Design a binder for this molecule. Structure first.
Ligand code: A1D5K
Ligand code: MG
Ligand code: ZN
Length: 292
């Protein structure tokens, strides 16, 4: 309650002051409270606070409830990963101009899902406690926080808007299962290759939202080299130490997963090229170290 008091009373700096529009944004030098203020700015500059009548102390409490339900003792899948995932979603909407292709309810759901897509994660090698089981658990935690007293940032929505938002949130979180991405990316690419891609189709739009969440989920692979080098160390720490081969594994992950995804994202909106460009540069540096 003492952390909510300093957060709710603080001033929220501009988006340019917080550097949350750059695709190269990094959270390393930031406090936990500074990331919470950046998250408020993302809700603010997307007009989500205005268009849905969010009261300030409820958004502060919800943002705080979300970051506490991430586990500090997990190297990568923690609050900083969720905060960075939502930041790239903000950058892809603003700097990538994707914001105009979507509705307010879709933007509202994408930001909430990005912050919540990995809630209560305990590490990739600590999944024994238990068709995307983890993603279903992540949404259960997201819905529980959304319904917690004092944290209902969606109270200003009609019952019609509330369920449309809830179903987009659930599909966006489930899309972060790479298994689902692998089974659906083939369709996504095959319509890009024919210029048949049409976002007015509801099946098309849901597929694009699914690929967009994967793009920001793995957006650490697109960061500048000193940043990606450190994040890859965090990933390797969680997959090894339960809390060195890395260059080879980053190149394979870039070849099999990320390259085509960011290639397809730039075809949809050319201004998200810095994501594809940054991922190519990281593949170049990881490959050079793979050759010793
Ligand atoms: O879970 C995520 O959201 C995520 C985000 C980024 C990456 C990434 O950059 N690489 C790899 C490959 C991988 C697997 C195991 C160990 C090592 Cl070192 C590398 N997996 C990632 C997974
Ligand atoms: Mg996940
Ligand atoms: Zn994730």
């Amino acid at each position: 309650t003492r952390e909510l008091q300093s957060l709710a009373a603080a001033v929220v700096p501009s988006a340019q002051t917080l550097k949350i529009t750059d695709f190269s944004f990094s959270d390393f030098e930031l406090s936990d409270l500074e990331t919470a203020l950046c998250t408020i700015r993302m809700f603010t500059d997307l007009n989500l606070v205005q268009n849905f009548q969010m009261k300030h102390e409820v958004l502060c409490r919800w943002i705080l409830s979300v970051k506490k339900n991430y586990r500090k003792n997990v190297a990568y899948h923690n609050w900083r990963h969720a905060f960075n995932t939502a930041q790239c979603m903000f950058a892809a909407l603003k700097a990538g101009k994707i914001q105009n292709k979507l509705t307010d309810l879709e933007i509202l759901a994408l930001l909430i899902a990005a912050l919540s897509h990995d809630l209560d994660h305990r590490g990739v090698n600590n999944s024994y406690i238990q068709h995307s089981i983890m993603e279903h658990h992540h949404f259960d935690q997201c819905l529980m926080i959304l319904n917690s007293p004092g944290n209902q940032i969606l109270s200003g929505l009609s019952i019609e808007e509330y369920k449309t938002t809830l179903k987009i949130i659930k599909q966006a979180i489930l899309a972060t299962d790479l298994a689902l991405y692998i089974k659906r990316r083939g369709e996504f690419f095959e319509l890009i290759r024919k210029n048949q891609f049409n976002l007015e189709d509801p099946h098309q739009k849901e597929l694009f939202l699914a690929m967009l969440m994967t793009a920001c989920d793995l957006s650490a692979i697109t960061k500048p080299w000193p940043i990606q080098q450190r994040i890859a160390e965090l990933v390797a720490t969680e997959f090894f130490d339960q809390g060195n081969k890395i260059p080879s594994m980053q190149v394979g992950f870039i070849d099999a997963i990320c390259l085509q995804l960011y290639e397809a994202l730039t075809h949809v909106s050319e201004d998200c090229f810095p994501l594809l460009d940054g991922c190519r540069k990281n593949r170049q540096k990881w490959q050079a170290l793979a050759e010793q």
